[PDB]
Each structure stands twice: as structure tokens, then as C-alpha cells.
């Protein structure tokens, strides 16, 4: 059952949306301000929740699941990007740490490649579960490699320039569709890990 809700009582906290949101079990965010930037549907990580993730993690994790580890770090990176974006515009920026800038840069690419979608195409609106899990695992591995390389001593511009074509290929790998191979997985995602390891090793030194 997928039912859309909209407040009509004169406020966002009316009893219809509160009863419909309380009676529901899945959370799908949608903001009008975030949808104006070509990011529809703009989901909220703080208001999103799923109760069947534990039961679905047994069968989905039994087949080939990695969605939970990159999903928790993706939600924490989205909350840290929202807190850094609100604290930057609120307090006023005169400097930026590489750890928060790497999480904001990973959250912008995750919001662009994940939040950016349409309802009239199939190339940029259709993606498999294995390709989305490999892309989210590649983005979480790039964020963990950038956070681990930033702790060893490095700059943010040296880390982004050290990454280079890895973020451009991972960000530019969301417009294709499955037309190669004998399954949903593609060979372009497996080859990005070897170049991402050498780019992460060269970006640190």
C-alpha cells in the first residue's frame, strides 16, 4: 500500500498527517524546497524510518546485501552534511575542516546521484539493486577512504584532486542502464575499486 498524504487542515502538524504518519510503517520524505533544485524526491534522513529492514536484511543480506553499512554511514553523512550546512550558513563560514568538507562533498554527490531523479526517463531513473548497492558501496568506500586518508595527513584539494576521475565516473555512472553482462551487475563497478584503491593510496601520500 503506497498512499500519498498532504496536509489540508492549515498546518504541517495536523491530526490527519499525524495519524497517517503514525499508522504507517515506512517513511518516504518529500520537500518542496529541495524539489526545486532538481532533486525530487528530496527525502529527509531524520524523518525517514523503516521497520522491515531487520526482516528484509535476512533474505536480502542472505542473497547479496551490503545496504545497511553504507546506509547508516550515508544517513550519518546526510545528517552531518545538514548540520554542517545549517551551522555554516547560521554561524558564518571563515574556514572549513577537511573531514566535514569531505562528508559534505560526499553528501552532495550522494544527493545528486541518489536524490536527483525523474519520472519520464529510464537511463537516469532506472537502476538495479545490485548496481545501486555497488554504487552506494563505492561511495561509502570512497568516503571511508577519504576519511582514513585525511586522518593520516592530507589536504581537501589534494584529496579531491587525488581522487579525480573516480568521483566523476561514480557520479557519471548513474545515467547508463543494464545492457552488458549476463546479470544485473556490471564490470564498470568492479574496475572502479582497483582505481579507487590506487587513487586513495596516491591521494594520501
Amino acid at each position: 500500500i503506497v498512499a500519498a498524504v498532504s496536509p489540508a487542515g492549515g498546518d504541517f502538524s495536523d491530526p490527519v498527517t499525524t495519524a497517517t504518519l503514525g499508522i504507517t510503517q515506512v517513511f518516504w520524505g518529500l520537500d518542496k524546497k529541495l524539489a526545486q533544485r532538481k532533486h525530487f524526491p528530496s527525502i529527509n534522513t531524520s524523518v525517514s524510518y523503516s521497520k522491515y529492514t531487520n526482516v528484509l536484511n535476512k533474505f536480502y543480506d542472505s542473497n547479496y546485501p551490503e545496504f545497511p553499512v553504507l546506509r547508516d554511514r550515508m544517513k550519518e553523512i546526510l545528517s552531518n552534511a545538514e548540520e554542517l550546512e545549517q551551522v555554516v550558513q547560521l554561524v558564518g563560514k571563515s574556514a572549513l575542516s577537511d573531514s566535514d568538507k569531505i562528508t559534505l562533498d560526499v553528501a552532495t554527490l550522494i544527493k545528486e546521484d541518489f536524490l536527483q531523479q525523474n519520472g519520464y526517463s529510464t537511463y537516469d531513473a532506472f537502476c538495479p539493486i545490485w548496481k545501486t548497492f555497488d554504487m552506494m558501496r563505492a561511495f561509502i568506500s570512497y568516503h571511508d577512504e577519504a576519511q582514513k586518508a585525511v586522518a593520516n595527513g592530507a589536504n581537501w584539494s589534494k584529496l579531491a584532486d587525488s581522487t579525480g576521475d573516480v568521483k566523476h565516473a561514480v557520479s557519471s555512472s548513474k545515467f547508463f542502464e543494464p545492457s552488458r553482462g549476463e546479470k544485473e551487475v556490471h564490470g564498470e563497478f568492479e574496475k572502479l575499486l582497483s582505481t579507487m584503491q590506487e587513487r586513495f593510496a596516491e591521494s594520501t601520500d
Binding site: 548540520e83 554542517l84 551551522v87 554561524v91 574556514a95 575542516s97 573531514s99 566535514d100
Partner: peptide, 9 residues
């Protein structure tokens, strides 16, 4: 934690 981002490392 919030003052560490504004102040710096």
C-alpha cells in the same frame, strides 16, 4: 563537537 567545526582542527 559543534564548536570543533567552527573553530577548526
Amino acid at each position: 563537537a559543534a564548536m570543533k567545526a567552527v573553530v577548526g582542527e
